């Protein structure tokens, strides 16, 4: 316990400001990205333990991005965000290296709850 680097990977604007302000006051230094390529760049200059991959990006599937994250360090918690039902490679995704897979529309309460339950942060 002694760090809090998060990386929000996504292109659609809007949610990037929700996870930012929320993880901003809560006490988390999250960043912003888009193409998996960038997510890796910041992951190498920051090496965050929480990586959010949005499969709703208009370009490619982050599925491969994760494979690269775990390959670097199996001790890297990387969450995902896609359909909240049709499990398309979501059940196996975690098996490789993905805590859980949120979806949209999601609730800032369930997001700050799981994250706060995963990584430890100044509380009380």
From Swiss-Prot:
Task: Write down the top EC class of this protein.
Answer: transferase
Location in the cell:
Cytoplasm
**What Enzyme Commission number(s) apply to this enzyme?**
2.7.-.-
GO BP term, example: sporulation resulting in formation of a cellular spore
| Residues bearing the modification 4-aspartylphosphate | 54
Cofactor note from UniProt? Binds 1 Mg(2+) ion per subunit.
The protein's UniProt keywords, in alphabetical order, are: Cytoplasm, Kinase, Magnesium, Metal-binding, Phosphoprotein, Sporulation, Transferase, Two-component regulatory system
Q: Which cofactor does it need?
A: Mg(2+)
Mind telling me which SUPFAM superfamilies this protein's record contains? CheY-like
- Could you confirm whether the keyword Transferase appears in this record? yes
Tell me which residues bind Mg(2+). Answer: 10-11, 54, 56
Q: Which residues form the Response regulatory domain?
A: 5-119
State what this protein does. Answer: Key element in the phosphorelay regulating sporulation initiation. Phosphorylation of spo0B during sporulation initiation.
Which named protein is this? Sporulation initiation phosphotransferase F
